[PDB]
Every structure is written in structure tokens, then in C-alpha cells.
RNA sequence: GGGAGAUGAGUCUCCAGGUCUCUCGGAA
RNA sequence: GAGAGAC
């Protein structure tokens, strides 16, 4: 993904898009009884903690495109995945605008707490000004659709979140591409049944884990991914997607029976315009972070990538023997034969992809490890590392949130086991706020977990 | 380093995506 | 009406 040009709004006639430059995060009452190195991310160019130029660090992820049209491997990969997908019998018909605004059984309503994006956010107009779940009204949506059209620019923001001190100094804060309400409804209408189909079938048919619940899914992954585990990580996945991969995604959607009108919307994601502060810019390639179905589309393309890298690197690969589950850029996979992931990364480089540093005892996925239950080793605990639970607990947007914050942390933390869950809890109970909280009890958590099966 | 508010240099406050999972509080 | 985490 690569910026083509940059132009000030004065010249592009664009409304200016500026959000906070101060974090809502501040140390909690637990900030000092727990260790951690994460601080809120740089929002402002003059952050005293910066050691790099802020904006050039922000946009250094747009590292360019290498390839614009599929080769034979990407084509075959895309046909393999597409053929695998046919058995889901995805409905290619357009979803109703009411369904796509207010949600179905397997696709949540458009989220009305967040911005309505360009131009709406800049006009002062909000999602709930236009959408109403009491009435289920689509009329006001039709109107603003007409008035403002589609393929509107994305609103670039900077994500206000905890990050590691190193990313703070490198200025590598996270850029958000806010979606216009119009493009969200339209993309959802085109692909909503596709979303519901994926959300409904986390696993190795979809090749995706969107919609998984780690508590039970984690026991399935060894059964789902037999053979030799290989995994790796991407650096800047979304931004390093060359157009070649959007061409491949369109072949999948065509193969699964989509009209050419629905397939056309993908080029609107390949090619995006963003307003950041008071300038606008073209981006060619790259998955815009906040479009509709990014995690579905990011996971679909990951299925294409892995397939394409295998058959281009190694002779004698049977793609039918590949097993893989993806969550956007995250990936766990297996194949009957062990895979040389360095050889893999060297051809990934030829496609403009950067992969970096495997059994069940070391694997991670959605940031959790795999820990067999000692009394029932076929049941797998997803293990959020305590070091990260510690990073979260040390900060707050709001002290009234403490009891709900700590309690979510406990539902992640206990999978690490009794001895570690009790260290965590007794550290919390060493300050008087912590002793006032209702803390879920370990045997209750384990008991309710086992009953899930 | 934009805009609005409160306040009278400054101080605080508001803006900030797509989805999934879990969970707290209201409802019939 | 909210939160927390994950991509
Ligand atoms: N608020 C967020 C955070 C992440 N993601 C998705 C987009 C890509 C991936 C980024 O994961 P990171 O937390 O940045 O971990 P990483 O892959 O190791 O680091 P990076 O993507 O910055 O290189 O998650 C997202 O859509 N929204
Ligand atoms: Mg990973
Ligand atoms: Zn353009």
C-alpha cells in the first residue's frame, strides 16, 4: 500500500478532520503495585517522549506496492480457497438496508456509539441522528445516501491506547481510517450475508476465526490443525497489501457467485482517499483499517497469501492438506510436513510482505497461549499472559470503571492457573479499592468453564 | 496542532474506525 | 446504558 499524492484541503475542498491530541488514559490505583512498561500512545507531534519525527513515523507503514496483478500462484491459491468456500453456500444477494443497519443473528447492528465519519462527523451530525433502532427506520439513511453518495474519504485518526514504550519513542502510534456511515451501510448490503456466514463458521472451512470464543475454540484448534504447526507474524500487514491481493480477493468473490456490481466495491477499498487534519491523500493498495468487513477481508486474503506462498516456494505442495485459521493478520496453520518459514518469508518479500519470528507449548493466537487442563488435558486454556493483564490494570479512562475493569481482567487471567490467579488477586487486594471489589473466585471460574463442554 | 465549551497566561472538558468475544447495568 | 480484551 502506497500513498500516491498529498494535497491540502484548501485545494481538495475537504472538511478538516481533527480529533483529540490528549489521552483519556491515566494511572489507576493499581499503577504502582504492578509492573509494566506501556504508556498511552503519542497523539501530538510535540510529545516530549518522542525520539523520531512523529508524522513520518505515522506514515512509514505505507511501504509501497510490489505487484499489481496476480501471477499463476496467486491465481491458483485464490481458486483453491474460493473452491473451499463454495460449500458454505454463501448468499450473494444484497442484504436489506434495514438488516444491514440494525443487524441480524450473526452480524451486529452498525455501532451507533462511534462517529458517523465524513462528512457527518465534520458536520456535527451523528449516527443516531440518522439511525434509530426503536423504529428500524431506513428512510433517513436513503436520504443521506442520496445527498452524499458513496466512496467517501476515510477520516484518519490516531488511536488513543496503551502501547509499549519503544513504539512510543519510535512514534509508531496507530492510524485509524474512520468509515463514512454511507460506505459502511453499502459494503454491508453487498457483503452482509458473507459476514454472517463467516461469523457463523469460525474454523478451517472459512479459514477464519472471526466469531470464535477462545474459551471453547481453543480446545478445537489441535483437532482442527493436525500435523506440523507452522505460524509466523506479519509486520504492518494491512499497509503492505499490494493491489495484487485485492485482484485475488475479487476472483474469490466472483468464483463464489457474486455479481460484478458487488465485486466492484473492492476497488473502492484498494483505492482510498483520506483526510488527516487538513490534508487529503491517495492510497493505492493497503486495507483501510476501519472499512466494513476488514477482519473478514483481511482473513480471506491471508488464506490466499499462505496458499500462494506454499506453492511458489516448495515443489510438491498439496493445498488440500493445508489447515489454517486466520483472524485478519493473525494466523495459526498446519501441514503434514514441517514448513521452512524462512524460505516462506523470502518469497513473501517478493510480494512486499514482511514476516518475522513451533508446537502447541509455544504457539499463540489472539495473544493467548495453549495450556492443557491438568485434570482434563484435551481441554485447552487460552492463556493471556499476566504481563499484559498487568499493563491493562495499571491505567484507566475512569475510576468508576474499576470493578468492571478488574473483573474482565480476571476472566482472562485465571486460565493461567490457580497459583498465578491467586498471586494476581492478592496483589489487587493489597490496596483498599482492590479489597472492596467483588473478585470472581477461581474454583467458580474453572467450574463454569468445564460446564461449557 | 484544528474546533467548540466552561473559567478567568493558563485550567479542565468535549471530538477519536471496523468487527468479534466475554461481561456489568437497565427492559418485556 | 456501559466496560474489558482480541484482530
Ligand atoms: N485497534 C486495532 C488494533 C489492531 N487492529 C488489527 C489491524 C492489524 C493488527 C495490528 O496488530 P498489533 O497490535 O499492531 O500487533 P502487531 O501485528 O505485532 O504490530 P503491527 O501491526 O503494528 O506491526 O490488528 C485493528 O483493526 N484495530
Ligand atoms: Mg500471531
Ligand atoms: Zn485517488
Indicate left, alpha or beta for A117 from its phi (over 0: left) and psi (-120 to 50: alpha).
left
* Interatomic CA distance for residues A377 and A119, integer angstroms: 54
CB A199 within 8 A of CB A295: no
Strand partners, A3: A283
Quickly count: other Cβ atoms within 10 Å of residue A117's Cβ. 24
* Interatomic CA distance for residues A118 and A124, integer angstroms: 10
Residues with CB under 6 A from ligand 1: A 159, 233, 235-238, 289, 328-329
Which residue's alpha carbon is nearest to atom 16 within ligand 1? A235
Burial class (CB in 10 A: 0-12, 13-18, 19+), A376: exposed
Residue A328's nearest nucleotide, by CA–C1', is: C7
Ligand 1 atom with minimal separation from the A295 CA: 26
Strand partners, A272: A283
Quickly count: other Cβ atoms within 10 Å of residue A223's Cβ. 10
Residue A329's nearest nucleotide, by CA–C1', is: C7
Q: How far is the CA of A200 from the centre of ligand 2 (A)?
A: 22
Residue showing cell 503492505: A240
* Interatomic CA distance for residues A435 and A16, integer angstroms: 47
Residue partners of A364: CB distance under 8 A and separation at least 6: A231
What are the residues whose beta carbon lies below 5 Å from ligand 3 (ion)?
A 282
Residue A298's nearest nucleotide, by CA–C1', is: C7
- Asked if A160 CB < 7 A from strand C, the reply is no
Peptide bond into A119 cis (omega under 30): yes
The third-level CATH classification (topology) of the domain covering A367-453 is Mitochondrial Import Receptor Subunit Tom20; Chain A (1.20.960)
The resolution of the experimental structure, rounded to one decimal in Å, is 2.5
CB A224 within 8 A of CB A323: yes
Closest to A274 (Cα-Cα) out of A285, A284, A283, A287: A283
Closest to A428 (Cα-Cα) out of A374, A380, A392: A392
Q: Report chain B positions within 7 A of protein CB atoms.
A: 1-3, 13-24
Which residue's alpha carbon is nearest to atom 26 within ligand 1? A289
Q: How far is the CA of A385 from the centre of ligand 3 (A)?
A: 42
Q: What is the 3-state secondary structure (H, E, C) of chain A?
A: CEEEEEEEHHHHCCCCECCCCCCCCEECCCCCCCCCCEEECCCCCCCCCCCCCHHHHHHHHCCCCCCCCCCHHHHHHHHHHHHHHHHHCCCCCCCCHHHHHHCCCCCCCCCCCCCCCCCHHHHCCCHHHHCCCCCCCCHHHHHHHHHHCCCCCEEEEECCCEEEHHHHHCCCCCEEEECCHHHHHHHHHHHHHHHHHHHHCCECCCCECCCCCHHHHHHHHHHHCCCEEEECEECCCCCCCCCHHHHHHHHHHHHCCCCHHHHHCCHHHHEEEEEEECEEEEEECCCCCCCCCHHHHHHHHHHHHHHHHHHHHCCCCCHHHCEEEEECCEEEEEECCCCCHHHHHHHHHHCCCCEECCCCCCCCECCEEEEECCCCCCCEEEECCHHHHHHHHCEECCHHHHHHHHHHHHHHHHHHCHHHHHHHHHHHCCCHHHHHCCCCCHHHHHHHHHCCC
Determine phi and psi for A340, rounding to 5 degrees: -75, 100
Ligand 1 atom with minimal separation from the A289 CA: 26
- Asked if A303 CB < 7 A from strand C, the reply is no
Q: How many alpha carbons lie under 13 Å from residue A141 in its C-beta half-sphere?
A: 26
The domain limits of chain A are 1-13+70-202+243-285, 213-242+293-359, 367-453
Which residue's alpha carbon is nearest to atom 12 within ligand 1? A236
Q: How far is CA A191 from the centre of its chain?
A: 18
CB A2 within 8 A of CB A278: no
Which of the 106-135 residues on chain A come under 7 Å of nucleic strand C at their beta carbon? 113
Which residue's alpha carbon is nearest to atom 27 within ligand 1? A289
Which residue's alpha carbon is nearest to atom 21 within ligand 1? A236
Q: How far is the CA of A329 from the centre of ligand 1 (A)?
A: 8
Q: How far is the CA of A360 from the centre of ligand 2 (A)?
A: 13
Residue A112's nearest nucleotide, by CA–C1', is: B17
Strand partners, A212: none
Cell output for A282: 491517495
Which residue's alpha carbon is nearest to atom 25 within ligand 1? A289
Distance A109 CA to B26 C1' (A): 19
Q: Pocket of ligand 1, candidates A238, A240, A294, A357: which has the most ligand atoms within 8 Å of its Cβ, to mutate?
A: A238
Distance A305 CA to B5 C1' (A): 50
Distance A149 CA to B14 C1' (A): 29
CB A218 within 8 A of CB A330: no
- Asked if A292 CB < 7 A from strand C, the reply is no
CB A155 within 8 A of CB A273: no
CB A224 within 8 A of CB A332: no
* Interatomic CA distance for residues A323 and A221, integer angstroms: 10
Cell output for A375: 485434570
The third-level CATH classification (topology) of the domain covering A213-242+293-359 is Alpha-Beta Plaits (3.30.70)
Cell output for A195: 459476514
Determine phi and psi for A153, rounding to 5 degrees: -65, 150
Strand partners, A8: A279
Amino acid at each position: 500500500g502506497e500513498i500516491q499524492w498529498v494535497k491540502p484541503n484548501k485545494e481538495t475542498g475537504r472538511l478538516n478532520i481533527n480529533g483529540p491530541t490528549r489521552t483519556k488514559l491515566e494511572p489507576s490505583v493499581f499503577h504502582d503495585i504492578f509492573e509494566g512498561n506501556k504508556e498511552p500512545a503519542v497523539l501530538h507531534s510535540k510529545d516530549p517522549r518522542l525520539e523520531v519525527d512523529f508524522e513520518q513515523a505515522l506514515f512509514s507503514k505505507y511501504v509501497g506496492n510490489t505487484l499489481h496483478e496476480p501471477d499463476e500462484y496467486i491465481k491458483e491459491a485464490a481458486l483453491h480457497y474460493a473452491n473451499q468456500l463454495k460449500q458454505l453456500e454463501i448468499n450473494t444477494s444484497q442484504m436489506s438496508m434495514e438488516e444491514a443497519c440494525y443487524g441480524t443473528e450473526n452480524l451486529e447492528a452498525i455501532d451507533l456509539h462511534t462517529s458517523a465519519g465524513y462528512p457527518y462527523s465534520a458536520l456535527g451530525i451523528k449516527k443516531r441522528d440518522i439511525l434509530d433502532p426503536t423504529t428500524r427506520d431506513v428512510s433517513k439513511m436513503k436520504f443521506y445516501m442520496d445527498k452524499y453518495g458513496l466512496d467517501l474519504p476515510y477520516s484518519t485518526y490516531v488511536k488513543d491506547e496503551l502501547r509499549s514504550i519503544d513504539k512510543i519513542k519510535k512514534g509508531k502510534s496507530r492510524l485509524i481510517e474512520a468509515s463514512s456511515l454511507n460506505d459502511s451501510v453499502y459494503l454491508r448490503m453487498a457483503f452482509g450475508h458473507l459476514y454472517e456466514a463467516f461469523h457463523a463458521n469460525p474454523g478451517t472451512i472459512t479459514g477464519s476465526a472471526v466469531g470464535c470464543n477462545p474459551d471453547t475454540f481453543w480446545s478445537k484448534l489441535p483437532i482442527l490443525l493436525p500435523g506440523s504447526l507452522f505460524a509466523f507474524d506479519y509486520s504492518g500487514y494491512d499497509a503492505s497489501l499490494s493491489p495484487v491481493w485485492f485482484r485475488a480477493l475479487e476472483l474469490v468473490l466472483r468464483e463464489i457467485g457474486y455479481s460484478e456490481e458487488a465485486v466492484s466495491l473492492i476497488e473502492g477499498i484498494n483505492h482510498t482517499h483520506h483526510v488527516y487534519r487538513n490534508k487529503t491523500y491517495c492510497v493505492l493498495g493497503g486495507m483501510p483499517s476501519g472499512c466494513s468487513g476488514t477482519s473478514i477481508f483481511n482473513s480471506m486474503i491471508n488464506n490466499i497469501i499462505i496458499r500462494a506462498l506454499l506453492i511458489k516456494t516448495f515443489k510438491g505442495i498439496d493445498l488440500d492438506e493445508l489447515n489454517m485459521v486466520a483472524y485478519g493478520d493473525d494466523v495459526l496453520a498446519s501441514y503434514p510436513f514441517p514448513i521452512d518459514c524462512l524460505e516462506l518469508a523470502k518469497t513473501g518479500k517478493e510480494y512486499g510482505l514482511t514476516m518475522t519470528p513451533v508446537n502447541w507449548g509455544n504457539a499463540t493466537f489472539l495473544k493467548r497461549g495453549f495450556l492443557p487442563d491438568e485434570q482434563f488435558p484435551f481441554l485447552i486454556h487460552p492463556t493471556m499472559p499476566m504481563r499484559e493483564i498487568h499493563e491493562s490494570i495499571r491505567w484507566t479512562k475512569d475510576a468508576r470503571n474499576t470493578q468492571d475493569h478488574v473483573r474482565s481482567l480476571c476472566l482472562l487471567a485465571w486460565h493461567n492457573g490457580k497459583q498465578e490467579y491467586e498471586k494476581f488477586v492478592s496483589t489487587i487486594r493489597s490496596v483498599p479499592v482492590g479489597r472492596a471489589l467483588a473478585i470472581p473466585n477461581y474454583e467458580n471460574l474453572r467450574r463454569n468453564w468445564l460446564e461449557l463442554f
